[PDB]
Design a protein around this ligand. Structure first.
Ligand code: FAD
Ligand code: FAD
Ligand code: GP7
Ligand code: GP7
Ligand code: HNM
Ligand code: HNM
Ligand code: HNL
Ligand code: HNL
Lengths: 425, 425
């Protein structure tokens, strides 16, 4: 039996396990899959032999993501930007300008005013309290309704909606305004910052950091799916799909929120958590790597397409590239390549699609979703509580970060807190 | 004897006189100078025979200035923009972009944040209450100190300071932050709007409108300088530099604030007004028309020069133009043409200065100043009170507008209110 069992071998689990180990605790890490890293998943391209790609989490910004920056410095892990953006091919209407910030002068006043309104609203959020504890319910409404009250002209309206679609992984009618404002608050109260945090990538893949961290973790079991966590006795018992149990004084749940509902907790989790847990969050983010021919380097496209964003990812050859598109899996079927072709040619009518690569995170039983985003009304009912301990079971992960939810940084942050909580008695 | 005497034949006096006349009152307008229009002064160029120029007020924006827009529609008075701006020659440092909005991407986050801060502060101002009645004293500090707390990077910092210098007619150390915020509030809570209200000009000069209005005013005396206003009796007595008095039930003071201190009021004006009146406001605006050779059309220059702004005004010929520069008369001596040459060549090293035209508003005894701007600390002590009646004497004018101070629109607004006050008993 162990001081602590960590369930899940993403960045959160890995951090918690390593740090508890270095503190002299006896730790076991159980990972249900065949690999470590979770929603950070670098691997060989399905389309391009010998090419390493990120199929989940990839981007970081050292200034918004200091714990991650610390990890990188700690292990000497190189980063860079994946591409310079120099060619802008927007679909925002005839008055848009082809630049990174495509808003024309005739919209400037409208943007100014909306900027003030969004940031005012964002400043209502205190990041330590939880979204359900601050009288923020009036903001917990469908994003499209919120944006309708800003009454933006066409370019700025579509620009904001596109990036919101991209970033939340939900269409505007399903996204919560409060959640959009949450991401603005997490970026030091900045709208710009949300998109500007796409700043660098791992030069050798996320696996670089995953492997570094795992090297400091003495006991790991892969292919070990936790099905049960029972703290009815003096010591927590963790049952596993095989049926061969492990015991510890403390258990860290570092699996995705949308998979909690498949674990049997004993006793049952506190009742106010239960409904949201059963439902799951509404995240439907979809990231598609697109192998193309005839694309110039450095393309960025933002617009009103079924892909709100489409931008440069990497050089394959003199004539071939990968692009990345974001949409959501409720709106778009990535296995309909004809659809892919249509969505790309909308922005880039000269380009030929050669193929696509993605991971169906929502269909994967180890995840049941991409990154976190609430359904409308969820997190103004319960949010902080999701990542609070239930007796000796701690809940960590990006999904439950108050400080940086949906980011690698949030995984690290939450791990920090569980480790400290465990070290204090 | 008259229902009303109006003192001053600027837009405020003219409006008040006309409207009282049309209401069936018996009105006399006394103007101390040889012309009507006051600080709106179109006349022939000192530099270019046969050319009409604006030596004071010139610019308007129909959307911010609806009363003025009404006047223009009423008399069929044509307007246009004086020039397209197409060539940007800024002195804002090597990272500036040569566009109307010269802020580069690396400053975007900083600007976003400052935008929120300025507008938040501006939203503290309710435009009907007066700046001395709202607990705004913490904002009534030197602009440079306020701007230092925004901690802007270099381009945005200098850009904001330049336009503030231009617009307030005061260097940053003498300008009040609260007053800058007042102009932001007057423009429907917009920073951009302050500069965007430079939108059209009178196609035939301000005198077009002045002449239209004066045609509706049956009794006008020019060269009649008021020296005394005495309401100790039942009927107000207005003494005049000649010594030949006029009497009325009501008197409208529509002369500039900085000339009130030369009038003998009986009884004395209410005591809390007296000190600011004696001191005068701190407006030192200076507008210089510059006759040039070798300038391309459509130039706008903003920067850190002794002229914060320098921009296109009109075509004289294929090789000659007028530009306009704003600075202030405490900082700059317009009769030092060598200085003028230096200030222009800073932005435009290829251009030859042929000559200059301006009016020394501060030296003119009928004005003692250009447009209104408070000294630091003035208007958070007394501001609304300056434009309130003292018994039967009303105070109007741009100088005292709560709603649009320093603009033609403010002259019209204040006249509106005095007329209505007089019509009601
Ligand atoms: C398409 C996509 C793109 C992204 N892009 C970015 C980005 O650019 N930048 C950024 O910062 N973030 C990005 N993210 C978000 C980020 O990758 C995740 O928030 C983060 O990796 C989550 O780490 P974690 O430790 O919370 O959970 P995960 O990485 O999900 O780890 C959970 C672990 O639990 C395991 N598991 C599940 N059920 C069980 C079970 N019952 N028993 C045992 N193990 C179990 C899973 O196998 C997994 O290894 C992206 C996410 C996705 C899906
Ligand atoms: C250089 C400059 C540029 C400007 N640019 C713009 C601009 O682009 N757009 C804009 O909207 N505004 C502009 N303004 C501000 C605007 O012109 C004025 O606020 C407005 O014209 C003031 O009108 P008024 O009726 O309040 O006062 P004024 O126009 O000053 O009228 C005052 C009248 O009082 C007379 N007078 C003074 N003392 C006496 C006395 N004792 N007895 C009898 N008569 C007396 C004066 O002769 C004058 O005719 C500018 C002002 C200046 C100086
Ligand atoms: C009393 C002090 C006042 C201080 C004034 C500072 C602000 C004055 C700005 C004046 C000029 C604005 C020009 C508008 C742009 C334009 O027309 O030029 C456009 C390019 O303009 C733009 O880039 C517009 C995007 C800007 C929106 C940002 C809104 C928030 C900004 C708040 C600013 C705060 C300032 C510094 C802290 C020409 O492309 P077009 O031909 O296809 O169209
Ligand atoms: C969760 C939803 C998030 C919504 C995100 C919308 C905002 C995303 C913007 C992303 C891109 C920003 C790029 C920055 C500009 C750039 O790099 O490109 C620059 C040109 O950029 C600029 O014009 C900068 C001026 C903008 C400042 C305005 C600040 C207030 C704006 C608030 C915005 C609100 C958005 C719409 C309502 C290239 O010249 P350089 O090579 O010489 O340097
Ligand atoms: C840099 N600004 C462009 C807007 C989006 C963005 O910043 C971005 C997008 C992709 C990428 O790899 N790097 C940056
Ligand atoms: C249009 N934007 C440029 C900034 C200043 C400005 O708007 C301006 C200046 C002079 C003029 O005649 N018209 C407009
Ligand atoms: C930065 N975020 C965190 C969750 C999804 C991810 C992401 C990355 C790139 C992009 O264009 N949009 C979203
Ligand atoms: C618009 N304002 C009102 C008072 C001064 C005037 C003005 C006009 C043009 C310019 O560039 N700056 C200031």
């Amino acid at each position: 039996m162990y001081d602590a069992i960590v369930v899940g071998g993403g960045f959160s689990g890995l951090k918690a396990a390593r740090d508890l180990t270095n503190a002299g605790k006896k730790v076991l890490l159980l990972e249900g899959g065949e690999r470590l890293g979770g929603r950070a998943y670098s691997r060989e391209s399905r389309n391009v032999p010998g090419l390493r790609v990120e199929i989940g989490g990839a981007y970081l910004h050292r200034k918004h993501h200091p714990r991650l920056a610390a990890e990188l410095d700690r292990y000497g892990i190189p980063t860079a930007a994946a591409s310079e953006f120099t060619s802008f091919r927007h679909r925002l209407g005839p008055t848009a300008v082809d630049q990174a910030f495509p808003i024309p002068g005739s919209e400037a006043v409208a943007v100014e005013a909306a900027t003030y309104t969004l940031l005012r609203d964002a400043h209502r959020i205190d990041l330590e309290k939880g979204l359900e504890n601050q009288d923020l319910e009036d903001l917990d409404i469908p994003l499209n309704e919120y944006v309708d009250k800003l009454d933006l002209p066409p370019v700025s309206r579509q620009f904001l909606l596109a990036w919101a679609w991209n970033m939340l992984g939900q269409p505007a009618d399903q996204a919560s305004a409060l959640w959009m404002l949450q991401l603005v608050a997490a970026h030091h109260y900045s709208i710009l910052g949300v998109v500007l945090s796409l700043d660098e990538v791992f030069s050798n893949g996320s696996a670089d950091l995953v492997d570094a961290m795992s090297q400091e973790i003495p006991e790991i079991r892969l292919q070990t799916v936790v099905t049960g966590i029972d703290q009815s006795g003096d010591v927590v018992n963790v049952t596993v799909k095989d049926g061969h149990a492990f015991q510890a004084h403390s258990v860290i749940v570092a699996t995705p929120m949308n998979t909690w509902r498949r674990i049997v907790f004993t006793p049952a989790l506190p009742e106010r958590r239960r409904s949201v847990i059963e439902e799951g969050h509404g995240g439907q983010g979809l990231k598609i790597l697109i192998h193309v021919r005839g694309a110039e380097a450095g393309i960025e496209c933002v617009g009103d397409g079924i892909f709100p964003t489409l931008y440069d990812y990497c050089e394959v050859s003199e004539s071939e590239r990968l692009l990345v598109a974001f949409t959501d899996s409720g709106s778009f079927d990535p296995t309909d390549i004809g659809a892919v072709k249509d969505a790309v040619l909308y922005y880039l009518p000269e380009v030929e699609v050669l193929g696509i690569d993605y991971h169906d995170w929502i269909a994967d039983p180890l995840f049941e979703g991409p990154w976190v985003a609430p359904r409308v009304g969820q997190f103004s009912r319960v949010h902080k509580e999701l990542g609070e301990p239930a007796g000796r079971i701690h809940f960590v992960g990006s999904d439950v970060s108050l400080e940086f939810p949906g980011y690698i940084e949030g995984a690290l942050e939450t791990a920090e807190c569980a480790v400290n909580a465990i070290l204090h008695s």
